[PDB]
Paper text:
A 1.85 Å resolution crystal structure was determined from a crystal grown in the presence of 10 mM glutathione (∼10.7 equivalents relative to protein at 0.93 mM). The structure was of a different crystal form to the apo structure and contained one dimer in the asymmetric unit. This structure revealed the presence of glutathione in one protomer, again revealing a nonsymmetrical dimer. The glutathione-bound protomer was ordered from residues 3 to 230, whereas the other unliganded protomer was ordered from residues 3 to 39 and residues 55 to 231. The distance between the Cys16 S atom and the glutathione S atom was 3.7 Å. A sulfate ion was observed in the same position off Ser14 as in the apo crystal structure, again with Arg190 positioned away from the sulfate ion (4.6 Å). Considerable movement of some components of the active site relative to the glutathione-free form was observed, indicating an induced-fit mechanism for cofactor binding. In the C. immitis structure glutathione is bound in only one half-site. This is consistent with binding studies on human GSTZ1-1, which showed half-site glutathione binding even at saturating glutathione concentrations and are suggestive of a cooperative mechanism.
Residue numbers in the entry:
A (entry chain A): 3 to 230
B (entry chain B): 3 to 39, 55 to 231
Amino acid sequence: TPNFELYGYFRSSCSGRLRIAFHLKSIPYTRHPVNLLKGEQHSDTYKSLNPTNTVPLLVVSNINNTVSPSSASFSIGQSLAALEYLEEALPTNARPLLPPISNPVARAHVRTICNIIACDVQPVTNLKIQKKVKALDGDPTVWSRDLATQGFGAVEKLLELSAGRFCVGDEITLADVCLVPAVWAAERVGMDLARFPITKRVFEEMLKEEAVQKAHWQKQEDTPEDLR
Amino acid sequence: TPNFELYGYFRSSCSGRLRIAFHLKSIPYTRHPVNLLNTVPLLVVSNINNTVSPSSASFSIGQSLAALEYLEEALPTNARPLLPPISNPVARAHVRTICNIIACDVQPVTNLKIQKKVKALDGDPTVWSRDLATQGFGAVEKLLELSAGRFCVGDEITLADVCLVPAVWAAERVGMDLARFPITKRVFEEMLKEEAVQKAHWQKQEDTPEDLRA
Ligand SMILES: N[C@@H](CCC(=O)N[C@@H](CS)C(=O)NCC(=O)O)C(=O)O
């Protein structure tokens, strides 16, 4: 079985996706905080680890690295690729986070929700983009609020078809894993979550989960005291 | 009613991802071009058992990465798997990471919607987009330094290549220098040799304006 080390940041939504998945699946992992406010993502040493200068970075070891056989480890620098790797590399794990492969329709619904969040909301509202907006003399908060609002609109329309207790029927999936940290992020920029009633119900359902609380941005080792 | 109908646009990179996949996997689809001036691409999937909405025999997929993986899973015996086998989760992960750099970190911040928002701030959407594409291609190039053979990962075409090609076409529009990414350029050029990629070429669609056919 593989060993896992996560380069993460308490307030990184993409990091939180992995934090949630690890706890849900009962997979132990080693924590390596990277301070994004201090620009530790920008150091040459971290660019060597992840060439996008982003967190999370998942470093997997005790495995056969089929891409670089001489390497003791394998690095996964994008959260959705890392989430699917947990699913594929640990097929006997007691808590699959996708519908079974015999249900490609449900799997596509789950992935569509993940992609709206990970493609259309997070990347255009992250720190790097907010800084580019500020450098143009725009308001990064309004920019981000408008884009998150629009993206949550798309998520809500999907949940109108798929949601039961959770995003897609009555079991937690990768959709819920992506939803929770995106809601934490959207709240930082003053998005009105009540405009999205199903999304809000499902988010609140997830907050009851011990796995989600263990994963909370306010409960990490690198959460500053003032934010705990 | 067609099994697959693609609401697409000749110059949409995300549409281009799906065109390349359908041609490479030889999956027939009905083309539904959509004018510039509403999700594009939107893949409408019909004649199915809808396990999410059972009173319906169809659904749509408005995100290209989800649509790509759906084609893999809905047609498991297709002659051209675009992921490495499930027995090789490392290679699958490396493929998906390259796809995600492009689909998460490049395309969405350099698309029409965001270029318009940049212009609305009196910014230069070309410089903005070239800057972001250059940064993401830097990351793609670093991954290909580890994995590339003939193609992005090893010597077989995968979803990494399918995402790579339309991203190169989009990046060229904003003046990105592809020569700065030499393995990326090499794999891009290898893909252009493919009949399936040519059939999928942004310059060779039914809705390509005549002045952009060459
Ligand atoms: N698509 C990437 C996005 C990674 C990303 O943008 N991470 C953010 C934190 S959520 C980051 O490290 N930001 C650094 C910066 O913007 O300077 C993924 O899914 O991992």
